[PDB]
Design a protein around this ligand. Structure first.
Ligand SMILES: O=C(N[C@H]1COC(=O)[C@@H](NC(=O)c2cccc(O)c2O)COC(=O)[C@@H](NC(=O)c2cccc(O)c2O)COC1=O)c1cccc(O)c1O
Ligand SMILES: [Ga+3]
Length: 157
């Protein structure tokens, strides 16, 4: 158990960037703090993810299971949850940017996010995430960033 095998392909990721299509999310997220994300391979076609966010009520965490969906190569779709995530770009030794979308009966929501190899936002990741954001005619309130405001973190093992 807990062998150093596939585990190398999984771990924890710190989301130091955020983007929301709905004003409310932007308003709420812009006022909150950086979030967490840890993913674990449930199966060959199934995957599990643990979320950690600092909520006024305390560190709010949650773990959800998704299904493999190699849309744009290592993308994931959670039909049961109505949430899709697609890794846009990621550095083996640097920052990474992943795109996410969720659709509800009659409504489509998109949420862009950026994660750092550790709980620390980098200028490079910032400029990169923004460069793409600007290419889509994004607006400041549409994006959300968290500076050296870290404190609550999610465990890995
Ligand atoms: O519409 C979406 N959320 C709702 C509904 O989802 C939820 O309320 C919870 N959520 C999941 O259970 C979830 C289970 C499985 C998958 C999830 O993503 C869940 O979040 C908790 O998330 C939160 O409280 C907040 N959330 C993050 O800060 C976030 C930060 C980093 C990473 C996150 O995922 C976050 O949600 C706000 O989220 C919401 O209001 C939604 C859309 C697009 C992309 C999303 O991520 C959404 O969740
Ligand atoms: Ga979510």
């Amino acid at each position: 158990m807990t062998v150093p095998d596939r585990s190398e392909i999984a771990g924890k990721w710190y989301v130091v960037a955020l983007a929301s299509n709905t004003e409310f999310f932007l308003r709420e997220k812009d006022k909150m703090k950086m979030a967490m994300a840890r993913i674990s391979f449930l199966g060959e076609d199934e995957l599990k993810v643990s979320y950690a966010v600092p909520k006024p009520n305390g560190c709010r965490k949650w773990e959800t299971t998704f299904k493999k969906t190699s849309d744009d190569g290592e993308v994931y779709y959670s039909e049961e949850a109505k949430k899709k995530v697609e890794v846009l770009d990621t550095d083996y030794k640097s920052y990474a940017v992943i795109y996410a979308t969720r659709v509800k009966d009659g409504r489509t929501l998109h949420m862009m996010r950026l994660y750092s190899r550790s709980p620390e936002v980098s200028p490079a990741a910032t400029a990169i995430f923004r460069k793409l954001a600007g290419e889509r005619n994004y607006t400041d309130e549409m994006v959300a960033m968290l500076p050296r405001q870290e404190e609550c973190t999610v465990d890995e093992v």
